[PDB]
Amino acid sequence: DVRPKITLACTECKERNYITKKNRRNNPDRMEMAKFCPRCRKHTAHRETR
């Protein structure tokens, strides 16, 4: 509850590529990251699903 599991999906293809954890109090808002999309075949921006 305090450190939940969050899924990072590409902002291009909506592909739920990664899963990680955060604190939900230190980072109340959805996280932006620069991850690698196996579908888009390059590094795209990944956002926490909502």
């Binding site: 599991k5 899963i19 990680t20 954890k21």
Partner: protein, 67 residues
Amino acid sequence: PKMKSHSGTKKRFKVTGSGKVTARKAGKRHLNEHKSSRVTRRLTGETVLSKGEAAKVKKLLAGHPGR
């Protein structure tokens, strides 16, 4: 009476051409977020069975070729 095969064994183990008994690696069905890509890759293939376990599997199979 024909002797039946073991249904879980039917569903879980393959027998290769040379006679090896192989199972799917265990531990990747869920709880995969904390597992690294290395741990997941280690659990992602097929495992050749040990001698005693392979003999037990071939006994449980009724001459069934595995899956």
